[PDB]
Amino acid sequence: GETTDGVYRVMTRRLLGSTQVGVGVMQEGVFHTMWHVTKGAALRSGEGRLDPYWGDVKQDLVSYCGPWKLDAAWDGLSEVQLLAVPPGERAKNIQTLPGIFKTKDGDIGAVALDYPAGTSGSPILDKCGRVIGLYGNGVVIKNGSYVSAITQGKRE
Amino acid sequence: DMYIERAGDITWEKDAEVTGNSPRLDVALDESGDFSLVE
Numbered sequence: 001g002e003t004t005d006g007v008y009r010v011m012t013r014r015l016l017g018s019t020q021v022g023v024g025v026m027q028e029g030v031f032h033t034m035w036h037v038t039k040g041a042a043l044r045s046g047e048g049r050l051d052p053y054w055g056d057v058k059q060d061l062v063s064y065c066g067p068w069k070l071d072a073a074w075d076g077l078s079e080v081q082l083l084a085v086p087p088g089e090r091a092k093n094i095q096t097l098p099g100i101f102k103t104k105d106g107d108i109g110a111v112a113l114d115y116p117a118g119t120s121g122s123p124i125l126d127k128c129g130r131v132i133g134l135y136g137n138g139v140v141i142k143n144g145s146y147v148s149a150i151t152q153g154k155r156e
Numbered sequence: 157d158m159y160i161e162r163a164g165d166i167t168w169e170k171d172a173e174v175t176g177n178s179p180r181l182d183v184a185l186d187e188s189g190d191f192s193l194v195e
């Protein structure tokens with residue numbers, strides 16, 4: 001099916017109507033999304049099939065047709081944009097300055113934007129349009145708001 | 157069965173809506189890929 005670079009919606013027809021379970025990025029012939037969106041299952045694109053290639057539940061990431069291609073990183077200082085693709089709504093760029101997730105294994109960028117759970121997998125971009133990670137795995141803080149990690153994979 | 161549908165190009169947009177704050181939080185990541193607040 002379609003292998004043009006860009007952002008895509010991940011849909012399912014098992015529930016009522018067509019429901020958006022998440023979002024992904026197609027780059028260099030490889031489709032990149034979050035593991036919790038597809039659970040590693042195969043994807044359809046037109047009449048074509050996208051089979052899983054690499055995945056990891058702890059990183060909450062999965063790639064299709066080939067290895068993880070996204071290697072850009074947040075520089076730690078600059079503002080970024082979330083290219084939010086919410087269910088049933090148009091793709092929209094939202095500019096924000098990331099916070100920080102302080103872990104025992106290092107610090108990770110974090111974006112404090114609130115969107116429906118079906119927006120998981122929407123890419124976070126740098127000022128050059130490069131994908132520095134995906135939105136959709138994070139935490140719920142005191143005020144019920146959501147803070148997602150800037151989740152990036154490794155390019156071998 | 158799941159399927160994909162194109163939603164747009166991946167580009168930075170000048171004059172986009174600026175929102176969101178920058179919190180610094182102590183977090184932990186379990187074997188299941190779930191984040192939690194360290195308190």
Ligand SMILES: NCc1cccc(NC(=O)c2cc(Cl)cc(NC(=O)OCc3ccccc3)c2)c1
Binds near residue numbers: 115116189
């Ligand atoms: N560890 C992987 C994983 C598994 C399952 C799910 C997830 N991800 C999420 O739950 C998720 C992802 C996104 Cl993009 C946004 C939110 N938002 C959120 O919880 O907002 C608060 C809220 C809730 C309900 C009504 C109104 C407000 C959650 C990760």
